[PDB]
Amino acid sequence: GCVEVDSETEAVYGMTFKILCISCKRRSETNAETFTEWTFRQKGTEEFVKILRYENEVLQLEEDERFEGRVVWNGSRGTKDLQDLSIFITNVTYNHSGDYECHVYRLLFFENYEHNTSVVKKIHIEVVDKANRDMASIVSEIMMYVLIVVLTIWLVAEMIYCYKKIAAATETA
Amino acid sequence: GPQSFVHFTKQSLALIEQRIAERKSKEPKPSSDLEAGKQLPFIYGDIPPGMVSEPLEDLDPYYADKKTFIVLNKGKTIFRFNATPALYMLSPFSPLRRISIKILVHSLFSMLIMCTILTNCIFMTMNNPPDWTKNVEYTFTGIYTFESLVKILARGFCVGEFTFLRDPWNWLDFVVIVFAYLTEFVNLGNVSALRTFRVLRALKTISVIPGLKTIVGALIQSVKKLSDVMILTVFCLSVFALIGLQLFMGNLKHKCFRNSLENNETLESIMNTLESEEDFRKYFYYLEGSKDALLCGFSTDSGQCPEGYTCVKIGRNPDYGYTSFDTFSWAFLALFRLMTQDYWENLYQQTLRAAGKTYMIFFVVVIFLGSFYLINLILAVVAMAYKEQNQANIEEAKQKELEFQQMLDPYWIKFKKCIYFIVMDPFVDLAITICIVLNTLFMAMEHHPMTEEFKNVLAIGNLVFTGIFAAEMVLKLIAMDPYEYFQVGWNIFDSLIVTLSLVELFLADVEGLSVLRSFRLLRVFKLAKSWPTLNMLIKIIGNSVGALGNLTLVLAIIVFIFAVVGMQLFGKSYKECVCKINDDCTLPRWHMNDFFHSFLIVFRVLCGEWIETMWDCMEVAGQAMCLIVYMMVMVIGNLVVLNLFLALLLSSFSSDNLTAIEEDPDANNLQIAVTRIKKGINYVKQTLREFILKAFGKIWWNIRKTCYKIVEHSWFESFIVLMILLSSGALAFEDIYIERKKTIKIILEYADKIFTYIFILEMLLKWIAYGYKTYFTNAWCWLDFLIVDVSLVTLVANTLGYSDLGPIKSLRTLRALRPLRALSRFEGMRVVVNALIGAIPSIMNVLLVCLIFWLIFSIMGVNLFAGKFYECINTTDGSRFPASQVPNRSECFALMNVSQNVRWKNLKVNFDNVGLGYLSLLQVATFKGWTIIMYAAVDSVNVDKQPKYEYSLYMYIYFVVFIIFGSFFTLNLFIGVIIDNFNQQKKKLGGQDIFMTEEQKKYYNAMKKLGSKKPQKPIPRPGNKIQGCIFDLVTNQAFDISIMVLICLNMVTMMVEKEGQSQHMTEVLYWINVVFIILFTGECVLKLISLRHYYFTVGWNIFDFVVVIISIVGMFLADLIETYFVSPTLFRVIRLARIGRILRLVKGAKGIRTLLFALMMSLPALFNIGLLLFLVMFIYAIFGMSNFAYVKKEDGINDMFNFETFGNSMICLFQITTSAGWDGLLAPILNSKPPDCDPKKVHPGSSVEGDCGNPSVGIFYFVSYIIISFLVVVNMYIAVILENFSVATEESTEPLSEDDFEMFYEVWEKFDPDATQFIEFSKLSDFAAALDPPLLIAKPNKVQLIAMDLPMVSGDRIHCLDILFAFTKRVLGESGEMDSLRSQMEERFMSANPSKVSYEPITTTLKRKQEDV
Amino acid sequence: MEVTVPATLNVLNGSDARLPCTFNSCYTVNHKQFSLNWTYQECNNCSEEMFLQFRMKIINLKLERFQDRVEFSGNPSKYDVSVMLRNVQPEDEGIYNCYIMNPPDRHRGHGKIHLQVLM
């Protein structure tokens, strides 16, 4: 089943990065004919330029040079009922930092009814020079060592105490 | 008077008259062995040949005065008549009456009536009969009228004590006659309703067939005892119906309505102008292929309308509108359906989808406390009534048999003999028994997709086995004389079977009974040396048609009656109003238009499925007529079924069978041969050994002591339990939405790392504390060891090396077992587990028998429906092609060539081999998935032929027979032995309860007493004049009874709330409720003024006081709720408070208070079971949500019910705990190959591939689950309820009279003036002679005074309390209260006299007298 | 379909003759699909002349042989399709037929009345 996950927000310079855009239908059993368009406002500017449009299983790329090459479809294949609209950058550069817009245009087909829907997803992408470990993993590892050591110490302390008491009471008689 | 034979003559009549005249001028029971209808006692010898069938004088002296005369049959039965001329016309000497009464008392007369009754029963089963049927029914009514005339003329009708109309059965007969004649002459419009009555001629079987009338009396008594339970059931259903109608009023009218509307149309106009499924599909959202619109909800945990639709409350309820909570009546119907668990899972799913998932709680409570508690209550009451009845009959039979005993106070013959030896040989029989097993195991290798050579192999093998068995049959017949041969039952059994085999080998073209050879292994029960389980089952089936043959017959009779009634009432309607229940305007699968289908419907109702067929009936024939007929079948039929089941259960599994056990003198060939061959094998073992041998530091002890302290302490244990709970929760957090929960993902990883470390530390500590011996000769420690081992393994591999690539990604799924570490930790679960383990050995012993029985049935099924379940369907529609377009499989393949999306597919669960035959039988036995298999069966044609509609119609017989022998008998045996095992465990441990801990027993003893305590304290009267009167008021019985009315009035006030009622009725019903609130508060205030402080002493007066407060705040709060805040969901749940005013109704009932008390006694045990069930469900949920989270969603698996989260999975699991719809969940798991599942489907947001299921895992999952659930919930709830119920209905014995102890003391002072509490033994002989009755002991006292074993203190002196105890124990006997009364009597004495030094006993009066003699 | 009519109806010349016809069809009468034809023949082997028909609405064909004396006198929703012949004349003697279809009920109903005109 479809699950809306959010994309990561930090790409390593020079490497490859996949931008996630997932939009599930409310009821999975229906039919649709989805198509998508992406726009991108580069950090330092205020306007969104269209970069790509993916309709009818053919991706037509805009005439932009920032994304000339360097980007390939990585969404749903050969369906026309497109639920994952993700794109993938190859050779990320600094110019690819800013806001992204994932316009999803869906046309649900019903009994006698045709509903033209639309959704928007905003993603913020920051290009760093080398990967940064997420604070969550760090503090978790740290606390997971702290707990181990404190348990061991508590146990050993209580053990030495009890053992002294036992050695005492042994030869008391 | 063995020669008391005197023709009732005119002289005798005159004598009787003068006797009566002399008695009436001056102004006991008859011997029950003399009464008419009995059999003539042998005490009188034979009849004089001139007296039989002739007016004789009455024998019983009780009638010797009254005007009677009895006549005796040539079968020695009694017929007591009246002497008055019938209708003042025919004296007992009128030749007419003479010859009539002669005819009446005759065996042939009865056999004739039985014959004609059965013939009429057969003729009633014709939907449309010809006219010569009119002639023969004229004959029938003629016969009935004639025999009724002989009765009325012989016996008498106007005058007497033994007359025609003086017996209800003749009432029935006369009713039949008059109905027949009146309808035959004058007729009305609804002639069918008239003719429906003539089925009572079938009821006349009860009257004519012997023994039945006693059975009907027994049933009516059983019902009479079912009085309080019905009231309790109605009351509970009513309470839950009020609750539901409060919560779910109008929810099932939710629908997804399209948003954009053209032509300036509104919802109102639309709903006013569209009345066809097509139009509703145009405007509302219908799931493809469904009949009702999809239900939606407003919350976040309810259904979801697709984009472009919105949820609105409009239209009609689902299921033609018969499923709702809109009015009280419909809510009551729905709850009754929930109680009997009839397709309740659909109601469950609908309600959860329209209201939200958090209302699962409602259904949890209802099912257990309603469905499970009431069935068992009904079970318990029926069982106790029956057990009492039977034991009464049997003790009376002992009394009668006691009374009876007191009344007694050439060369061919040469080789015949040589053959006898060979054919009896203790080895040939064993060989034949192994040959039988080989033959069945040979036949069991028969599967559908079978090469031809396999077929010839099987054919020649079957021929070989037929040869073997026929040869042995011939040998027996030639050694043993034919008569002696046909004497034994097994001989004729094997004879018939081998003869049928030969006959079909006779090319006679039967091809239907060759399967029946498979019935031959039942001979293995012979050599089973009364296998502790097998002979049990055979004697079950024997008792069914043998001892209890008069019950099965009644069941068959009533089923026939109901089938015919249903047909007569509803057949023509089913035919006419047909397009209302079927679009193609043809008859549905379950109709009532001919006898066979109506019978099948009735049978289906007894199995427990009555709601769908009932909905179809209510449309065609109206609601009221249909409801009444179904409810009578459901109530009466299930009553009789319960009776039959429990009868056998108790009769064949209780002290009865183990009592009067006789030894079998047959040296079984089994034991002989096994001893001989055991000696042979030990001999050859010994000679093989022979041939082989002839040819050829205190510190460490301190360490262990210390580790022992820490592991034993209590902080340590509690800490470990905390860690266990945390680890199990961590498991519960990992669903399919774990990707978006990032931080939690990483946290749970490191948390798993630390848990593993902790548990390894614990294990090491235990090792150093206990040691390897003590630790590894334990059972739980092995469990913890295994768990930590798999955890450590995966941890290691996950990090250093292979790092989760191989089957490690499958070993990782065994984390779901980590909660198993809780069983050992909690005592409440350890006791239940222990009991179940103790019961295990008897379970896997009836299991073998069950598998053998089902193996037979599955082989037969495989031979009947091997590869005949294939069909050529239109995948888009899902419909079978007409078998005139696509006749066979090649044609379907040609259509696949040309057209698209057609498929020659096959049922997932079929009979293609014995493996799936077992699965198929499991669905039939549980009635969950059975209908599809049954439809597939009655349509089969041949191996590669398109199925046709009801081509092989009578294959329904196959499933009917199985359900009876499998689904009904196997359940009997299982519940039978299991329940006995529990009774054997209790006795082992002292008769204590085997489901309670040691801390719960204390609680149990207290609440047992604190419940049932008769004596109370009267409340003093207040002093004041203005308070006196109020007190006189509130105490009267008048006052209490009146309040019981205002409670029922309040109940009916809640019952008239319906969906969409006028604003007026809302305001009125509001103001009425206010008045009721005023009145009960007033009652409370009056009680608190009459009883100044003693009001809070009574347990009930407190419960009223709470209800008063709660009801009031329910009024104010709800008012405040809606006005300055808004929350309808809360609004409703707070109005549930007013229900507490109805609960007070159980304060006056006495049966109900007793039945509920049995429940309160049972919570401690049911709570333990509830725990163990929950842990099992949790473990299954983790397995499910990690195996089945990506299945197709094809059926039973929906957007809301699936294994994607912990919420959803637990919801599904709770559903199938009652096995409801487990076939639906399994179905989408059994498809593992395209074009069913796509093994490379990508899911957005995850990395898992493919939505296929694993059939092997899939099957094991559900089959194991529904088994475990049956063993726990069904069989322990029955055990727990059964024990408490008995002790609940038990009273207490405390008959002591205070004046008797006073006289005991007042006489004691005459012998002990110094009040030393001691008396001399020489004076003991006169002390007992001065007491008044019942304490009086008549002289000689010395003979009884010694046998009481009175202890004696120093000085040949005796204490007072020992005399009181020895005197009290004789008048009361050896009762259970006697030692408890002795316990309190000594304790109060020890607290009053601390000088123990003077009470030491030296000897007893028996031992002292033994010293003297 | 059960259709209830009098097999023979005897009416005085000049009086009004109600030709009663009711039909026991379980399905509700949908005026958009219900069909009624009331025909008239002189003899069993003679030609039938349709004189009234309920196709969507009551259609009186105004046959010359009846002048304007035919009226509908029923209520289809109440399963009554009777007609009225005012001021009966001797030439009205003959056979009258009530044909009935009540979709989706499969079977067509037919009632036949022999009207006789008395002096």
Ligand SMILES: CC(C)CCC[C@@H](C)[C@H]1CC[C@H]2[C@@H]3CC=C4C[C@@H](OC(=O)CCC(=O)O)CC[C@]4(C)[C@H]3CC[C@]12C
């Ligand atoms: C005594 C035991 C052992 C057997 C009892 C059998 C009865 C339960 C059967 C036999 C006759 C049947 C009855 C035959 C006639 C009717 C009348 C029937 O009502 C109508 O026909 C109304 C017709 C109309 O109103 O035009 C309702 C079913 C009922 C009670 C049947 C209910 C089931 C009955 C009572």
Ligand SMILES: NC(=O)OC[C@@H]1N=C(N)N2CCC(O)(O)[C@@]23N=C(N)N[C@@H]13
């Ligand atoms: N088809 C079948 O197995 O018939 C039996 C009955 N009828 C249904 N429509 N069901 C839905 C699913 C189901 O399990 O099959 C069942 N649910 C219950 N409680 N019994 C079943």
Ligand SMILES: *[C@@H]1O[C@H](CO)[C@@H](O)[C@H](O)[C@H]1NC(C)=O
């Ligand atoms: C409202 O309905 C009327 C029908 O009488 C129609 O003429 C009119 O155009 C509708 N108005 C709109 C805004 O659709």
Ligand SMILES: *[C@@H]1O[C@H](CO)[C@@H](O)[C@H](O)[C@H]1NC(C)=O
């Ligand atoms: C048509 O069907 C047959 C199989 O029945 C197949 O062998 C043949 O190649 C098919 N031809 C076409 C037109 O697809």
